[PDB]
Amino acid sequence: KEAITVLMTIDSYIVTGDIKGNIKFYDHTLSVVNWYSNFKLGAIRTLSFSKTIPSLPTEKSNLPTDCTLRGDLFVVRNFIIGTFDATVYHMTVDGTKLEKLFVEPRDAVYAVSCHPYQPLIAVGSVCGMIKVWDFEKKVYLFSRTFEKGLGVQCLTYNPEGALLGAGFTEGTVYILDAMSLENESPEPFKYSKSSVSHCCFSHDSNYMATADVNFT
Amino acid sequence: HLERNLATLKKKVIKEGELHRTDYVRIMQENVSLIKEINELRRELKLT
């Protein structure tokens, strides 16, 4: 029933992947060989298979039950999966782990703020994500997923670096905890009613200001 | 006679073609149904 859009064929298997998180391998008869499904994974747009042709252990091994009348050993190449929502994963060929890699902003992008005394940089999307990196380490670290469907664009540190702040296209402003990205104010401040367009702190931590696209 | 025979023969032939197409697509529908049932059965083993 569900929408398919991926199709590639490996070493006399066919492989097919779906809008909603089910990936299937077939033999040229269109016979059914065991699938991968229902992980936190969907709309798989990137499939790819290893350069390495698999060497074949069998003395101890983890292979899934194929659906033949008997149901035999089954050893693909290694192969790569990735979603619509920009989520990148590698599978151990033996299935024992579905391992995810970097995970990245879904859609459109807006500019990042640096901590003034620490090698930390914060990135945010339009959608649902603000995340911080140590740009020396090149290491993905702390990040908080934001409430659904709010657009977000503006980001700031206070001059101490102790505070982080972000601006949201639907009339919405948060102050953030430069550690946990807790919503510092028990609710955010939602006084305006359209997109932010700037935010800044004073030299005094006590004061912060924003512009909105209504010229207010 | 010769003409009327030829014409009626051609008409018969045309309907023969109609029947041939009809049965051909009927068997294609059969093949579809079998393919579905194969998939169902192969899946059904998985749980056991």
Side-chain angles (χ1 to χ4, degrees):
Chain A
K1 200 174 182 179
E2 268 303 350
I4 295 178
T5 58
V6 56
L7 165 51
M8 68 197 304
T9 68
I10 302 299
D11 313 351
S12 199
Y13 310 148
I14 291 164
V15 202
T16 59
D18 79 339
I19 188 158
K20 278 181 197 169
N22 312 264
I23 300 155
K24 307 182 173 176
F25 292 70
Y26 303 155
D27 294 342
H28 74 281
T29 46
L30 310 180
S31 295
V32 173
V33 199
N34 209 334
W35 44 34
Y36 302 77
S37 62
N38 322 107
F39 328 110
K40 295 181 180 179
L41 175 77
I44 293 106
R45 194 53 272 198
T46 62
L47 294 186
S48 192
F49 294 86
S50 56
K51 196 289 202 180
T52 303
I53 298 164
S55 57
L56 181 59
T58 58
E59 303 94 321
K60 287 190 178 181
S61 50
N62 311 312
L63 311 181
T65 57
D66 153 61
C67 310
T68 305
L69 288 72
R70 182 175 186 172
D72 297 14
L73 90 168
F74 179 74
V75 186
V76 191
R77 296 210 202 167
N78 279 275
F79 87 127
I80 308 306
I81 283 173
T83 59
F84 279 6
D85 71 356
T87 314
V88 175
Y89 312 79
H90 173 288
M91 298 211 65
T92 68
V93 53
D94 74 349
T96 55
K97 190 175 185 182
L98 171 58
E99 187 157 61
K100 88 181 191 181
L101 290 78
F102 55 83
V103 183
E104 292 291 23
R106 213 195 83 164
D107 297 14
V109 157
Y110 288 116
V112 304
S113 201
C114 298
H115 190 298
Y117 294 108
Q118 301 177 352
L120 309 179
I121 190 171
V123 184
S125 181
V126 295
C127 174
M129 175 168 287
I130 295 196
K131 58 171 175 171
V132 182
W133 295 77
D134 169 336
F135 54 74
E136 283 287 15
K137 293 187 184 90
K138 316 303 185 202
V139 163
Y140 163 68
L141 53 89
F142 187 69
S143 58
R144 187 187 71 154
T145 306
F146 290 5
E147 303 181 43
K148 293 184 183 181
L150 288 176
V152 207
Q153 167 168 353
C154 210
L155 215 181
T156 192
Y157 265 97
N158 85 307
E160 189 163 331
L163 315 175
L164 198 82
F168 303 66
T169 59
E170 312 320 300
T172 288
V173 179
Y174 283 66
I175 296 173
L176 318 166
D177 158 18
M179 316 320 136
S180 69
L181 307 175
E182 158 177 337
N183 175 36
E184 266 285 1
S185 57
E187 291 178 47
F189 303 105
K190 296 191 176 176
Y191 212 97
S192 190
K193 305 182 184 177
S194 74
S195 187
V196 65
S197 52
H198 298 286
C199 68
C200 57
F201 276 93
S202 107
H203 72 288
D204 178 10
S205 313
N206 298 315
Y207 283 94
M208 202 188 80
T210 65
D212 75 35
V213 300
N214 298 8
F215 322 160
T216 302
Chain B
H1 143 266
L2 178 58
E3 170 51 25
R4 191 173 183 181
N5 182 26
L6 169 63
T8 53
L9 222 179
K10 190 171 180 178
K11 298 192 70 170
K12 288 167 57 71
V13 164
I14 295 158
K15 61 165 46 67
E16 299 277 38
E18 302 173 36
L19 273 300
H20 290 303
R21 289 289 193 271
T22 300
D23 199 24
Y24 165 83
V25 64
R26 290 285 179 80
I27 287 74
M28 297 300 95
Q29 184 181 354
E30 300 197 346
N31 189 267
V32 173
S33 187
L34 299 182
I35 292 291
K36 170 264 175 191
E37 200 64 8
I38 294 161
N39 294 7
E40 293 257 68
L41 291 168
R42 288 185 71 107
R43 196 201 318 110
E44 271 297 292
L45 187 65
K46 185 265 186 177
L47 171 62
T48 60

